[PDB]
């Protein structure tokens, strides 16, 4: 690790600076270095890790979709052959995306998840594991596509089971997990009815628990509840 010589606290400080500078590749590298110090992550640190890699892989996914769209048009009946270049460059971006996903999954497996005992940390990491298998699934086409999908499903399901036992229905981690597992059902598992059921039930159970919350907790929960509603509106 090229971050092995830097203090853990310095890596966290520089991750925050990189975020302010919109240098998310640097942010992710700093937070990978922090994880590799071997200590558990605090709540703030877990969110720095997720923000960094979400921004990195989000850009890769956007680029991959642009290139895949160009590639599909290039292979429509009537198009002018233009050689291997579109496929080659889509493959290049795809391989870099898979690399980032494998890096995140590696951090979760070595050893964030196994040391995570509290619901807020364990659900958070298992949600990440589902998310990064989901991004691998978006680009998968080979002998392993079904196994990648099932790895995402399995991680999301373990996270769901813990969240329903250990967190209130308005907990923002529980809500964001349900949001993303619902999108997994719709976009990856070809299960739109499951996606809609999950989003609606999550929204309704959260609504009924809002009365227990402070103003600041209410704002956090209703923000994610609006995303659930947004998707339901998209899908119905």
């Amino acid at each position: 690790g090229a971050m092995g010589s830097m203090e853990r606290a310095s890596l966290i400080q520089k991750a925050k600076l990189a975020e302010q500078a919109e240098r998310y590749e640097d942010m992710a590298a700093f937070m990978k270095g922090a994880v590799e110090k071997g200590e558990e992550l605090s709540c703030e640190e877990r969110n720095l890790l997720s923000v960094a890699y979400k921004n990195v892989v989000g850009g890769q996914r956007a680029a991959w979709r642009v290139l895949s769209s160009i590639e599909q048009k290039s292979n429509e009946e009537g198009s002018e052959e233009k050689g291997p270049e579109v496929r080659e460059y889509r493959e290049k971006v795809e391989t870099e995306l898979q690399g980032v996903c494998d890096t995140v999954l590696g951090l979760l497996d070595s050893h964030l998840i196994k040391e995570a005992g509290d619901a807020e940390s364990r659900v958070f990491y298992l949600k990440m594991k589902g998310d990064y298998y989901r991004y691998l699934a978006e680009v998968a086409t080979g002998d392993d596509k079904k196994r990648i999908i099932d790895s995402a499903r399995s991680a999301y399901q373990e996270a769901m089971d813990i969240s329903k036992k250990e967190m209130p229905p308005t907990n923002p981690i529980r809500l964001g997990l349900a949001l993303n597992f619902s999108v997994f059902h719709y976009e990856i598992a070809n299960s739109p009815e499951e996606a809609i059921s999950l989003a609606k039930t999550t929204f309704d159970e959260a609504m009924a628990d809002l009365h227990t919350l402070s103003e600041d907790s209410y704002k956090d929960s209703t923000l994610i509840m609006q995303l659930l509603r947004d998707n339901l509106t998209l899908w119905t």
Binding site: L179, D230, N231, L234
Partner: peptide, 5 residues
């Protein structure tokens, strides 16, 4: 695309 967080 749909919303994820």
């Amino acid at each position: 695309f749909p919303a994820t967080v």
